Amino acid sequence: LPALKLALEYIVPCMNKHGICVVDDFLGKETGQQIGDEVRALHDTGKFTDGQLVSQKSDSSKDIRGDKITWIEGKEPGCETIGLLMSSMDDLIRHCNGKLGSYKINGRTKAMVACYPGNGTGYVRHVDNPNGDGRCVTCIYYLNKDWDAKVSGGILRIFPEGKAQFADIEPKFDRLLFFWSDRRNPHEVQPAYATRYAITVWYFDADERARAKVKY
Numbered sequence: 001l002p003a004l005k006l007a008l009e010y011i012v013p014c015m016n017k018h019g020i021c022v023v024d025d026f027l028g029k030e031t032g033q034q035i036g037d038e039v040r041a042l043h044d045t046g047k048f049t050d051g052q053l054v055s056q057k058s059d060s061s062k063d064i065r066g067d068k069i070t071w072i073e074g075k076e077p078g079c080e081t082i083g084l085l086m087s088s089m090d091d092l093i094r095h096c097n098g099k100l101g102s103y104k105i106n107g108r109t110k111a112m113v114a115c116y117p118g119n120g121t122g123y124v125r126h127v128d129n130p131n132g133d134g135r136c137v138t139c140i141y142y143l144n145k146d147w148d149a150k151v152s153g154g155i156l157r158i159f160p161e162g163k164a165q166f167a168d169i170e171p172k173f174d175r176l177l178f179f180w181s182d183r184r185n186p187h188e189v190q191p192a193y194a195t196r197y198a199i200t201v202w203y204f205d206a207d208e209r210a211r212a213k214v215k216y
């Protein structure tokens with residue numbers, strides 16, 4: 001889908017209504033697999049960190065680490081298609097300009113590529129931007145082919161503010177997710193038992209970010 005039709009007919013009304021929106025088959029199998037290959041190459045050539053220190057034993061051979069990450073600008077060698085994904089995310093957002101809440105998005109972060117190693121680690125419940133750092137929208141692209149949460153876990157569970165229910169999202173291949181980054185969407189990644197990859201970019205609201213400069 002051109003994604004203008006995507007943005008205008010689905011993403012905009014969905015965000016203003018639910019604040020959590022899912023788009024499947026965003027880029028297609030060929031492009032999605034290319035991104036998957038670049039991501040796995042980054043992993044296989046040691047570009048990710050060793051993983052968030054989850055459990056720190058007196059003996060550090062037994063230390064348990066979780067999510068591994070690496071920041072990608074999109075111009076690095078071997079990251080061209082990730083850069084393409086980023087440009088595609090950017091186009092979609094640009095066409096939503098002035099229609100997502102009363103925000104005015106004027107920038108974004110580099111992409112955070114994350115890898116849950118599949119050792120039973122997940123990510124604790126949290127809010128992406130709880131203190132007004134400028135980020136208004138969280139964008140996540142998933143890379144996991146034939147992901148079966150019943151076997152592999154790794155579900156993203158969102159706890160919509162003021163609602164008594166969960167919003168569970170499987171980290172499926174070629175799936176694109178959008179959600180408000182503030183306290184409206186606390187969320188967690190349930191234990192992942194297989195390697196789980198995702199690429200996240202956060203979009204900035206011009207006003208919030210401008211005043212965050214002094215709040216430092």
Ligand SMILES: Cn1c(O)c(C(=O)NCC(=O)O)c(=O)c2ccccc21
Nearest residue numbers: 067069114123128140156171189198
């Ligand atoms: C590795 N990783 C994350 O996976 C998520 C996150 O919420 N992920 C949700 C998901 O992958 O479905 C994060 O929000 C996050 C924030 C700071 C540093 C690392 C982080």
Ligand SMILES: [Mn+2]
Nearest residue numbers: 126127128187
């Ligand atoms: Mn998060």
